Symmetry: D3
Subunit: 275 residues, 6 copies
């Protein structure tokens, strides 16, 4: 296993990525190309939450895929998240394509993972990057690669839907109201989506994920949705690994099966080798 | 996550280790000390099998523990495995103790994992390192640290028990017949053991693991034993990750739950935080 | 000791930092959080002087603190230093806060060091970052962390005060005349300052430091000022380590005690453990 | 030999460089300063071709010079190549000057290599960077260093001359028509040029290189030109090393002597030690 | 290109290797496995000459092969070169086999290069490793891999043949007189050999190489021999790259074609792709 | 500044070194060769104390010298310290000579530092390495380099003199009674020594250092001796940097000037540039 930490510059606003590369198993006769998952952590667009980076990355790596953690654009400074964050997701994917030979990467299996605030970036991208008109509008010309499916964990979907709380904050993320609501950007061309949240989420209302899923169904796009009956926002792995010390509110033993479900879902979609 | 590849020299025969360090989660208020698992791959004492290194290491890392992969002494050259391999397991543990500050390592939770040939080294160590008389005999004086529990996956236990096949091969591993049979070295001081194998193992007869477990019970030492009804030798993770390309004989969906069992067992023993 | 060389991107103009991390001492029972000092070298805003980077960094490290060397914005290109350099100092501090767990960093003890041209960036920041109105104006919204004290070595303070020599050069650094004079930005909210220079400085008149100190006193802010009676500009460590080969004009044995004074001053302010 | 991979930020649009540093030979009594060659690969301004990076870099390293591979600005996004790419070539050179002590670099021997699309960037730079009026216009103020000679392999020279094929593509590279034709920017101040191409080039007509050479002659600048009678575009090393697997059209045994010619030419110009 | 510096421990006397790995070219559709050359520098068994390491390594890398530089056992201490050095050559080869997946290495094309003192180690190995009786005697049991051809540059062949000068020195290298003369160990099973030297060699008489070649012919083993009419011992690359500063005696323009000859020879033997 | 962590193998018992390399200052016209100090920490021959490694290393680096931390042989296993540790000190020095070109190292200024147990290794070496008869006896043949001076901090000198406490422990370190007493190995050929200790040392009686100094005087070898009137054993830097958390017994403000004295002493001896 190799760990790469790089700045990528092929975007208006350069960003940092941290890649976790799988090594080829030594006693194999033939070499295998592994899937790759790009992870966008949460952090309310003001930071990137460690809880939703390496603990999750490692979990997916255990199932035999490379992972890259993307440091998408934030509010810090006087900067806005959009459109820059979309340009960065595209750059990352493009960069992966250029790393396929060196690292055995199956470009037919690039997957996007989003959590809380990072879920907005992913959900929006799933809409924009699949629509020629919007690739042009949001400057994704000439970026190679395309993702195959997305995974949303307690995602922020509509900015008018509960998070954030004030019209100033919503516009600070973006003044582009076409990107405010990710479910309004779903078309049949959108890639399939594994979505989960808890019903008792309070900082990012469950309505967010639901509206997205509703949009995928109505546009006949393959989706799977797990709304667990309990648990706070930002459960991450929902177990001891991502549990803040002392605080039992970060433990949910039923939500904690989400990775197993997600992985099984990837297999169903033909995006991960099956047992 | 950091990856360290080092030669350790505080043993008669220097060896290579590859350590996979957990990083502290950024948005924690207080820092946490994680458990650490040392992994001894299989390879019939002639090599170290990649299949039983990083795929397993990564799997355990996902449950929130550091891992170190130990390149124990091999037959290559005209060298023997013993006593040198025991000295190396002790050196590794000692070295970990010196790395605890830098990496947040819970020395009350050092765990040893063994697979096939690597299982012999571990099972033997669990006997020797816990017996003052044998620490002296096998030169473990002044090595700090002590492991807390061991995990054996389809282990080689008695060298007179099926593997290897010829009296020459057995002596090439070691001329020390006191180390030939790891179950004869079990005493109440032995640390607890999670053991698993398949009943249809042919290169290393199931009798090996059984005899060990039988010894642990009879010396009133806490143990757990999972003998799956089917599957070849060297299943590793028993899933797509460690499956040799094309060959379905490396897939066992029932044996594949061993990690989940093992981890739950570690929790029971108080050696891994519980959910 | 670890050495990190990274581009940081959470600012309009991305920059390079070189961090020198202290490692936890192995034979300590409990872990300790160390202070951290950010160093801005001189170079007349056209380059970063090596003399004022690692030789100084190492000197402070010896007293038991992490150091980061910041490559603040320069005139090169057609670029200006301001406002970008202020955004970068804030980004660096913010980034440190996100590295505190991994490296044991005491965020109640972040310190800023400035030399010659780098002194302007620091002195200005000490004014801006402490004034809510100016954090907003100069785009420091949402940057975590705050420094505790600053250290100025032969600093450039007022751009109308001797350095640079022509009105073109002054405006090339910045057209923002509110940032021209760092002493006019001092308010009671400014953090404490250790200031030193030589009286015989010719490229950056001693008047610069003096005016700053005068402003700190008049706003009742804790400060300490050492104006050595002799020596050229850019003495750095004033000893053999930073002495240009052959040239004795870079040796001043009385100015060379500045680090000892500075460190003792940090102790007085409670920003460095005391003996 | 050391390998460095860094983002450089002292330009409007930050870029990645990959440097291959020569190490000092251990059994030398005195240390030697080696030349350095900057390489701009081809890729039609949409990507950087691996074929024209390390295989070429390594080839030149064998003749005893450091190499740096520059990731010049691309069309990707909605970005244009110019003026940014010129700023980046200057930044790279400047950065090298700051690395001379650490790596023994002979700044009187910085050389620029260009291939296909990368040849345009180099050829243009050879014109701009040598003309005070154009350094000012294209923002190369305060960048230290200057190259000594350039090398063009099947270069794109005039954008109205065959590559690219549509007026949209030409303007997407740049709307600045003063940079469209690199031969119109040649003056006596231009540095000497080693130029080669194949006569049967179809994607970038041989006319391109010819027009450049013609301009160098007419301005009395030292140049050498090798137009091989056969071979496709993008032959690179023209041998097995850069040959796409299976495709014999990337093999030209006569064009394959270009490196030997180029190196001998560097010696003639006093830019590489001679045998 | 990646650079690896590792201690290998699977030998009685652990040794350092420095590997220079080729990276897969990014714009290839299919991946290619490259040959690998192991280089044993000279140094009179008291040191390893830098002149015969990276300058040569890089030269071969340019022709599209990985290289590893082996730090074979030396006289330093009271240690002898043999048998340990043979064990180390075998370990290196074995280790390469375990690195083939990760680095695309063609194990049907492992090549050994020897210079001066390093030539003895190689020439001897070519005899021992190919003779079952001698693999057993010199402890090469269970080492995977086998080399395909060897390359000797001004090699030391018979220790009674001019180098070294005193019977004490000869025995300090080894008391094993069966290894004193490498030509007496040639049998039809020996791998093919490219040999070169200068006729005016004085520290290691030309007779050495000649006797070896004579042995290869008489055992009907494919060999090629280039005895250049002039030049001192230890010419290395014979050009400016390996020329000690000031001393023209390290320049031979006719001997300097040896790499081109050697590479062409590798192609003839089917051990390097041909143009 | 670069940090190197390597195993060295040119000794019977391979060892780890951690080197801290000074980088050349960028804005120097000419390059300078720096001194290098090798540090042997304490630890009672059972471990290497972190307190006496990087905190001290960094302190000396601040005065403008490279440092290497040597992991000398320990009792761990059933191993003895001698003769192996002497072979390792010689190997380290030899290795440095081979690193001089790459890192600008002044081989006329190699210095050895010893603390507590590490002081024995140094003091003994200062005797052995300077006596042709003893280089032969203790196998230092063919190791290049030689140290210039040594520094002993609260050193263990005579093993019959207080440390260790039992005749078993003394022999476990070494059965070679010729190495038991380092002061009995002093001859005029011994290099100069800076020695310090506290008079109230209880685990290693002050008599140890005194006897050494007495031997240096009586053999007319230049020495300097600072016996501070108070303080425990293992004060290290005697300040907050090496102070175990909470325990004031590791603070001695008078002993804490030892580095300043030592450095000034190095200048007097011409082994460090003077101000």
């Amino acid at each position: 296993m190799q760990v790469e930490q790089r700045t990528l510059n092929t975007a208006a606003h350069p960003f940092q990525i941290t890649a976790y590369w799988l090594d080829q198993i030594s006693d194999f006769e033939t070499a295998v190309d592994y899937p790759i998952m790009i992870i966008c952590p949460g952090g309310g667009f003001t930071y990137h939450s460690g809880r939703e980076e390496a603990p999750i990355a490692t979990r997916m790596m255990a199932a035999g895929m490379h992972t890259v953690v993307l440091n998408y654009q934030l509010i810090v400074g006087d900067q806005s998240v959009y459109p820059w964050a979309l340009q960065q997701l595209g750059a990352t994917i493009d960069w992966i394509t250029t790393q396929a030979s060196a690292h055995h990467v199956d470009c037919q299996r690039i997957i996007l993972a989003g959590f809380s605030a990072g879920g907005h970036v992913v959900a929006t991208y799933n809409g924009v990057a699949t629509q020629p008109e919007l690739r042009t509008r949001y400057h994704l010309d000439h970026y190679q690669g395309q993702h195959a499916a997305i995974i949303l964990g307690y995602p922020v979907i509509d900015l008018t839907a509960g998070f954030p709380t004030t019209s100033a904050a919503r516009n600070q993320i973006t003044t582009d109201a076409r990107l405010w609501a990710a479910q309004r950007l779903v078309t049949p061309a959108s890639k399939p989506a594994f979505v989960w949240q808890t019903a008792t989420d309070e900082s990012v209302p469950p309505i967010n994920s639901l509206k997205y899923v509703q949009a995928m169904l109505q546009h006949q796009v393959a989706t799977a949705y797990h709304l667990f009956g309990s648990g706070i926002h930002g459960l991450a792995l929902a177990n001891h690994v991502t549990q803040k010390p002392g605080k039992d509110k970060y433990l949910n033993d039923q939500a904690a099966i989400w990775p197993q479900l997600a992985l099984r879902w990837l297999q169903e979609q033909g995006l991960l080798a099956g047992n």
